[PDB]
């Protein structure tokens, strides 16, 4: 027993050791008999009792003493406590009490000592050392006192007011939103001090709510002067020299299909039906890489931005509005340079032949998604008569998209078809209406045409075996997916598979089963919360969500920097023929940094976008205080339950407002159960709620239960 314990401890004391589960230790030690497995379990218990190893709350055994600790990122809470997120994502979160934070702020990389006694269900710890500081700038509202100011942070995870000394005011008045640079951190009983770096405006001025968010997330402001000079210097028409070595496609029937308000038209499409019954799809993408050359002023800015950001009232573009809307845009009935992906596609949706080449197009018409729907779905005779020459292509497009879809779904892609909000605002940025974003036939057609192209490009460059950027989606978290599999068995949905080896189709089968059920929205939602996020990578590690081995982003270089790179690599490798070792080594060095950065800038964009949506949703609901709505329970917690309305507005029912009974949370079923009444509110029950309180600043909506 002791010799086995020593051998296990010595193995765990190797420098290459990472914390492992019981099953991972079984495999790594090559334990095959059931009796040796018992010995391992008794040894792990005995060593954990002695304190020589620690089981994390994700059931992974690590040597504390090499730590007695865990390195990780702080995730603070607005009530003064935090959680450690360990660097090893396979490990569980460690709770940190407010008194044990030891001056650590939200996002800070820390080292946390594990407490030998937990007072609750999760593992507790103390911050012993802050390795890196995350927060240097803080947005907030300035407030003036006699001798000093203070700024109340917009991030409520910063629970303490930032002292501003009288010299660090720099012009800020009472109620001004300000950007504060931290000069000192909190220490003992002293709050953080800082100087006002920028004044945004008064908090009551139109659009300083949105401008605060832009500043909180550190989103890019105005373009640099040299970028603005480069953009201004770029021609508004094509030079005849640039038509050299480009396939002339100006006489073909080519069309863009976008939103009515879209000015940045990245993509144009054509579909010809061949005599054999196969389809020829031409996807033609804006040649941004021509105009924005490598290491140009606009290029350096486009890398720093990483993506365009689409906030409620405005778009922050990745490249200046002169290029994006002007020469790079595939504007109607003018000559435009394009990097084209042309594809012969059979009756099974299989790309038999393809070609990637530079071209010049002249778009026959700029269509919208509403017009194309009216033609195909609504059978509108006025619009058909208006666009009579294009109607035959639109019907062959629809069929082709349907074929591709069928192939994509068959292959086992996960159609995650959820209802998204679209906040409508006026010119002043006051909220008019929150409406459901509906994905029509016209969007789902284009989608399919952007997908197959993206898949085509990625496959080509995989087989070329040159340094390239992919858009990957790794397999889901086995712990997160395991819990999801438990959750769906409560509703009766049984899944074939284990969490470690799930094929996308098996997930699709569920989403098919729940379709047009009350439990749809949430199982959907909880499935999502089991998935990993998709990221850019130099390696082709496949795309779980699309159930494909090869995927990239090619089809939107105006608004995404990884698409602009794909174009430059296309130009480099295919067009110029520069497949030399030095060219490869250059790109192999730079793509990892690009892929990590751009992936960060995407996540940043999404977080900000959402943060403005939640703010404007809260602004919409201010006048609805007292009004009753029907909604569905989207999430249940120990403190209350979330209810989503029909327009995807979500608000909390706090357990305090549940005055009819003492409600106990059940975590296994996802339900609050009354002790006395025996009323059970579960995830996915429809209920009628009334609006009690809405805090716009906090972005909170509070609901009370009227009836079930």
């Amino acid at each position: 027993k002791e010799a086995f314990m020593e051998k296990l401890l010595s193995f765990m004391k190797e420098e290459a050791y990472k914390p492992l589960t019981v099953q991972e230790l079984e495999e790594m030690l090559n334990i095959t008999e059931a009796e040796e497995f018992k010995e391992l379990v008794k040894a792990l218990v005995a060593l954990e009792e002695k304190g020589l190893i620690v089981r994390t709350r994700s059931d992974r055994y690590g040597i504390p003493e090499k730590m007695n600790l865990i390195k990780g990122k702080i995730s603070a809470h607005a009530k003064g406590f935090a959680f450690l997120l360990p660097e090893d994502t396979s490990l569980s979160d460690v709770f940190i009490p407010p008194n044990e934070l030891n001056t650590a702020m939200n996002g800070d990389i820390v080292m946390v000592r594990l407490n030998s006694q937990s007072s609750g269900s999760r593992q507790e710890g103390t911050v012993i050392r802050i390795l890196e500081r995350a927060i240097q700038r803080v947005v907030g509202t300035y407030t003036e006192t006699r001798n000093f100011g203070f700024v109340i942070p917009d991030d409520k995870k910063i629970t303490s007011d930032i002292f501003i000394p009288k010299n660090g005011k720099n012009g800020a008045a009472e109620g001004h939103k300000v950007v504060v640079k931290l000069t000192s951190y909190p220490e003992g009983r002293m709050n953080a001090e800082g100087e006002v770096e920028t004044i945004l405006g008064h908090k009551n001025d139109p659009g300083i709510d949105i401008l605060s968010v832009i500043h909180k997330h550190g989103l890019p402001g105005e373009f640099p002067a040299d970028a603005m000079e480069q953009a201004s210097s770029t021609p508004d028409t094509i030079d005849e020299k640039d038509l050299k070595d480009r396939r002339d496609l100006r006489d073909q029937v080519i069309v863009t299909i976008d939103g009515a308000d879209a000015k940045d038209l990245d993509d144009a499409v054509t579909v010809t039906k061949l005599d054999d019954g196969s389809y020829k799809l031409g996807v033609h993408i804006a040649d941004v890489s021509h105009y924005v050359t490598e290491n140009s002023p606009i290029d350096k800015e486009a890398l720093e931005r990483g993506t365009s950001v689409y906030l409620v009232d405005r778009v922050i573009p990745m490249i200046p509005h002169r290029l994006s809307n002007g020469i790079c845009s595939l504007n109607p009935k003018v000559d435009r340079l394009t990097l084209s992906c042309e594809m012969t596609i059979n009756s099974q949706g299989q790309v038999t032949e393809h070609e990637i080449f530079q071209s010049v197009i002249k778009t026959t018409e700029r269509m919208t998604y509403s017009d194309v729907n009216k033609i195909l779905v609504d059978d509108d005779e006025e619009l058909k008569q208006k666009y009579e020459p294009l109607v035959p292509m639109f019907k062959d497009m629809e069929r082709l998209a349907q074929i591709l879809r069928d192939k994509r779904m068959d292959r086992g892609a996960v159609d995650f078809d959820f209802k998204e909000a679209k906040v409508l605002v006026d010119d002043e940025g006051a909220v008019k209406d929150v409406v459901i974003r509906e994905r029509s036939v016209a969007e789902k057609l284009i989608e399919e045409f952007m997908l197959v192209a993206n898949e085509t490009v990625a496959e080509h460059f995989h087989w070329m075996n040159v340094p390239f950027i992919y858009r990957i989606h790794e397999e889901p978290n086995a712990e997160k997916l395991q819990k999801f599999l438990e959750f769906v068995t409560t509703f009766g949905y049984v899944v074939k598979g284990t969490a470690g080896n799930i094929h996308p189709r098996a997930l699709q089968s569920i989403l098919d089963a729940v379709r047009d059920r009350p439990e749809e929205t949430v199982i959907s939602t909880v499935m999502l919360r089991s998935m990993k996020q998709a990221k850019y990578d130099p390696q082709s590690l496949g795309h779980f969500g699309l159930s494909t081995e090869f995927y990239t982003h090619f089809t939107s270089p105006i608004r995404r920097y990884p698409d602009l790179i794909v174009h430059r690599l296309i130009r480099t490798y295919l067009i110029n023929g520069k497949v030399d070792e030095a060219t490869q080594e250059k790109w192999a060095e730079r793509l990892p940094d690009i892929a990590e950065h751009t992936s960060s800038m995407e996540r940043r964009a999404v977080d900000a976008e959402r943060e403005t949506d939640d703010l404007k949703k809260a602004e919409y609901m201010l006048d609805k205080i007292g009004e009753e709505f029907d909604g569905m329970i989207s999430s249940v917690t120990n403190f209350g339950m979330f209810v989503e309305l029909p327009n995807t507005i979500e608000g909390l029912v706090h357990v305090s407002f549940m005055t009819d009974d003492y409600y106990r949370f059940d975590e296994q079923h996802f339900a609050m159960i009354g002790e006395r009444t025996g009323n059970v509110f579960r995830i996915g029950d429809e209920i009628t709620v009334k609006v009690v309180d809405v805090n716009k600043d906090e972005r909170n909506i509070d609901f009370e239960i009227v009836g079930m």
Binding site: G492, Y493, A513, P518
Partner: protein, 64 residues
């Protein structure tokens, strides 16, 4: 939130039409409530019977 049988004008539910009934059981095999399906009262009855006949004849299961 509409009745299948009032929508599609179906006066007679049949126990033999297994496919049709299978819409209206849970995955486990339990009869789905009117509130979930949106069924009309009248038909909820008819439907229940049929499933009950069905299940007797081993067309449907009692517990999938």
């Amino acid at each position: 939130k509409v009745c299948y049988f009032t929508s599609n004008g179906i006066t007679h539910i049949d126990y033999k039409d297994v496919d049709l009934l299978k819409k209206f059981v849970s995955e486990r095999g339990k009869i789905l409530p009117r509130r979930v399906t949106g069924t009309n009262a009248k038909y909820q009855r008819k439907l229940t019977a049929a499933i009950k006949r069905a299940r007797q004849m081993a067309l449907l299961p009692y517990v999938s």
